[PDB]
Amino acid sequence: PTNFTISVTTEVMPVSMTKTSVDCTMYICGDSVECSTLLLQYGSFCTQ
């Protein structure tokens, strides 16, 4: 080669995604007290 080109190119890399948390008692039940109980048997899964 007798010449050259100075090339600037982009590389797009994702680094982080959106952090999220879930209230099970709010998702599984709207505000039902009757659903808040009988959800106590599934509390270990929601802590997981």
Partner: protein, 48 residues
């Protein structure tokens, strides 16, 4: 007067209840309740 609440009971080695806490009294008791423990390490904790 009693109210409908969730509470965490600690049983000792002999089977007697010692040092209960009342969940949904303050958020510290709530994260004690969701951790199934009475010792809470330093950090940020999501509650309901």
């Amino acid at each position: 007067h009693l109210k409908r609440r969730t509470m965490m009971f600690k049983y000792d080695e002999n089977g007697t209840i010692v040092d209960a806490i009342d969940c949904a009294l303050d958020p510290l008791s709530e994260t004690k309740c969701t951790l199934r423990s009475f010792i809470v390490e330093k950090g940020i904790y999501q509650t309901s």
